[PDB]
Swiss-Prot record:
Multifunctional protein that promotes group II intron splicing and mobility by acting both on RNA and DNA. It has three activities: reverse transcriptase (RT) for intron duplication, maturase to promote splicing, and DNA endonuclease for site-specific cleavage of recipient alleles. The intron-encoded protein promotes splicing by facilitating the formation of the catalytically active structure of the intron RNA. After splicing, the protein remains bound to the excised intron lariat RNA, forming ribonucleoprotein particles, and cleaving the antisense strand of the recipient DNA in the 3' exon. Pfam families: AI2M-like_HNH (PF21368), Intron_maturas2 (PF01348), RVT_1 (PF00078). One of its GO terms (molecular function) is endonuclease activity. Its EC number is 2.7.7.49, 3.1.-.-. It comes from Lactococcus lactis subsp. cremoris. Homodimer. Its cofactor is Mg(2+). The gene is ltrA. The correct folding of LtrA seems to be facilitated by binding to the unspliced precursor or intron RNA. RNA would serve in part as a chaperone that promotes folding of the protein into an active conformation. Purified protein lacks endonuclease activity unless complexed with intron lariat RNA. It may preferentially function in cis by binding to the intron RNA from which it was translated. Mobile group II introns can be retargeted and used for highly specific chromosomal gene disruption in bacteria. Could be useful for genetic engineering and functional genomics in a wide variety of bacteria. In the N-terminal section; belongs to the bacterial reverse transcriptase family. It catalyses: DNA(n) + a 2'-deoxyribonucleoside 5'-triphosphate = DNA(n+1) + diphosphate. This is Group II intron-encoded protein LtrA.
Amino acid sequence: TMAILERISKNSQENIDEVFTRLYRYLLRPDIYYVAYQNLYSNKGASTKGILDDTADGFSEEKIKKIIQSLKDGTYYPQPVRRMYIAKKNSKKMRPLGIPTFTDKLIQEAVRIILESIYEPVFEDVSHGFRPQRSCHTALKTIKREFGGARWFVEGDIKGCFDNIDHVTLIGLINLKIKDMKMSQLIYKFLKAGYLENWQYHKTYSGTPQGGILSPLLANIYLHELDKFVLQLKMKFDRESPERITPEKYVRYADDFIISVKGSKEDCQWIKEQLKLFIHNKLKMELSEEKTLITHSSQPARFLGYDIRVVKKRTLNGSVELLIPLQDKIRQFIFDKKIAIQKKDSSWFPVHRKYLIRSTDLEIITIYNSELRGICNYYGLASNFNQLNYFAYLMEYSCLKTIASKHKGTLSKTISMFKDGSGSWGISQAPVLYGYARNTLENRLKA
RNA sequence: CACAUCCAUAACGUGCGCCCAGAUAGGGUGUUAAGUCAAGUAGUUUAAGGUACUACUCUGUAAGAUAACACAGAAAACAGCCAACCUAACCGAAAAGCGAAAGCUGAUACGGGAACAGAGCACGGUUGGAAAGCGAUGAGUUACCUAAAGACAAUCGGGUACGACUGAGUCGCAAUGUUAAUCAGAUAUAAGGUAUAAGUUGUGUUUACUGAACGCAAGUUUCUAAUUUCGGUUAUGUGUCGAUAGAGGAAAGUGUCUGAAACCUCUAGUACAAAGAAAGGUAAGUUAUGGUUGUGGACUUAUCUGUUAUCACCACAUUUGUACAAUCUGUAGGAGAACCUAUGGGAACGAAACGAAAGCGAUGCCGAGAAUCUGAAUUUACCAAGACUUAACACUAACUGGGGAUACCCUAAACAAGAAUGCCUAAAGGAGGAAAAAGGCUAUAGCACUAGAGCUUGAAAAUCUUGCAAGGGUACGGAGUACUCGUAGUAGUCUGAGAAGGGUAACGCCCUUUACAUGGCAAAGGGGUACAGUUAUUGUGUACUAAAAUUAAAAAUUGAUUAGGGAGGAAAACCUCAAAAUGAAACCAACAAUGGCAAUUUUAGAACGAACAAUAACAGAAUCGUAUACUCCGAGAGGGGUACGUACGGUUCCCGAAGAGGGUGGUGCAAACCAGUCACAGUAAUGUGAACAAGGCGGUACCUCCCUACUUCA
């Protein structure tokens, strides 16, 4: 089936030695190797990942290439290519996509496997967080409170991700110890495959039917090699960055980047300029925004919808850290769907909502509860539960307006909301307007 | 630091609509007449006007009483509302004769019934004068400590919207509108309000356009906003701690024990002035996305005789500006969280909102009250509608006569038409014998495919097919032209229009004369027939040649750039019996650097497809002049949508299926009593038995098709 790479990347042209990163992965080859040997390469033409609830569908056994990829059947990948990077709602980290083709919908597991190949080596943390993670939520909560006690701190801004798809440093750093020192080509001839017909051309990735949903993998690497020497120079300087500000460093991610333990912002420049030189050394990318708004001791930056600055408002601090919740992620998240106008009722109400004549109601209620759910998960360990339920207030009258509006009455939202509501205390009934909100903005949040 | 409130109010959705003849049957409409009304009290005066005045009376005048007279007002009838209240319309049922049921037949009785507003014409009509409402509960069932923190007896010690219920006792808003009484002028070109359609792009609002031509002007409503705790989570108050302020420091501060150096308390909210401190009422504006408003509630602006005064004088919000007051208050940038200047508590620090914007001259219109000044008047000077009745005259319809062709539905009408005896004992008797039917009769039973029944009919008869003059219903706004038939009539003079021309309108109507025999009329639905937009199906389609936006980029040189030619087991080596159990020449891979034609597009070398042939044109949101309440003031300009009440143009895009009503085909289930069939009795026909293969027939299930004035979804 597909032992093509199982042979290419494995034997790896040992004229002289090879995949040398072996003192930590020498039998770490055959483990996952023989996995795929019977995970993917077992007999599959049409399976192990894809449509059928995880897996590809066996409509024609999808063997038209899969079994016969000894030379990939290859030779052009015409596959009209376009551009694709999809932003992410919370904790901005764009999630590009591509063109769904059974061809691409098997290239997907192919690159899954090449991931696992490059997975076990010094790659770390499928999507972002220096610690090996998988979720944003772990990235959302864990790393942050741990440090920041050092003032004078900074962050990152360079867009540099789908703009700086360098594609030269890219293929220079994809498979160094993995490319067979000679004869390793039947891998990326069909990864370098952004073909088109518009009297123009752009190859190999922009969220490409060759390169659509795999930028996670690729860009994560792209940055990872950077972060390696980044950390080495980090420790090289971590000799007053943990020892200057003290008398009374860095961590890596996907899109934005903290500066960990701080000493002498008088060297924050040092950091950023060195970065740039390096950001311009081998990937040759700039400092979008000249990045970041140095706190200069404490002044709150923003990461992923949270931060630290080391009457609707009150807080407690000291020699301790903190993890800020915000309002701009809700502010326009209100002016989007006509959900309020803060210049109407005395500081903050849900003065109104949008929908007045629309489809059935209980679905809209579940919709409310759904965005609330999101809010909860999209807000882990950040303080001020009271702003959360404050917005919940700022959501009630609005959603209840919309409920009533189907009746098309006299603003009879009173009796209307009485015809339902987890908050009216009456399926013609709101299951949750605040309950699950409290539940999940406490669980997986307060710990 | 919890808990919590965000405006309540009805529609519009009635039933009708054709054709002409008439016109009090009634009614309406309008106009003129006459009377006829009623005016706080009387005089005045006069008609019996009218309210002007005189004097008398009354009521109000909160800008917080108290007396003076100023100041205003004093009915009635209408218009309306609010509630109760029969009753014709309109509705269903008896009801009722009725094709013999298709359809009619509804003051019976039936509830009702301001018909879902009366917008094409009010339910009526009596009354009554007040209902729905809110904002305060009046009365009952009631609460936490009894202000020390309690535990104690709620020492009702004591509090009813106490907070809940029952529930308002009382008020206000609810609950009104008009109605005759000097002119003339100026201050109006007054101060002030008013002038671009169905509509396109342009974003630095600059305006490139039209049913705008006006232009200027081009950026911009706004927030962004409180230090004398405005620290404690938005407006909601309570729940606080923090700091200062202690008061008993208890047995509470009703009577008992632990209280504490806490646990209540006002908190602890700065110095002036300043004003009403204040409502209510009226008036204007904000009020809540649906579309219309109404009716209230809240915010804002004004509002409501003079002194004699008692009063009058205060707490408190209040406003200023200072101080100062901290969170600074944000900002800006540096620079420690507590520096740095700035900021008015926003300077920007934006952000949203922002694009023939607004604002400026477009003069377009009028320019009330005409407010004030001038003159005039000044017999109380006058003076004429306010309705009611009648009168007359015109008028009139969802009123009064006669007028009914196109297609459906139904079946009576014998409506007319077309459907006919075996069997012997195998022959007259004859089946209207003695076998032997449907049909005749009746509920019709066995799922249909037997009605039992007796003779019967064994043409009787009832066969179905029609037709079905009938009889109904159905369309009698209105949705492009002609054109057709159905009636040439009934207005015959009189303005679709008879004609000519002229006003003739963003498509008519009216004026000079046409005609008296149709000269108009023609009728009156309705369908028909050809054209015209619709929607689709299909037939159908372009790189037809030129350059270009350079995919085509094969080929060729390049980019000799390294890496090749083994689906393998393969863990640093084993590499797979493999040149090979680790050795190329070109064939993939490099800005394809150029072609190269397909894939465009337009410039464009451009010929019924770079578009056309047979089978659907419904649904309009209302539609500008032509109004439509016209909408609203009228002092004007000008502001909305009721036969889809647009009546056309244009505007413009919606272009659904299902519930499934009923018919259609097929598929099945069943069924095997009758005629199918078999065999048996029987002389046969019938009886007997099998007989489901659904031969038909019906029951039933699916789906299909019609089917959709059967129902309903963008």
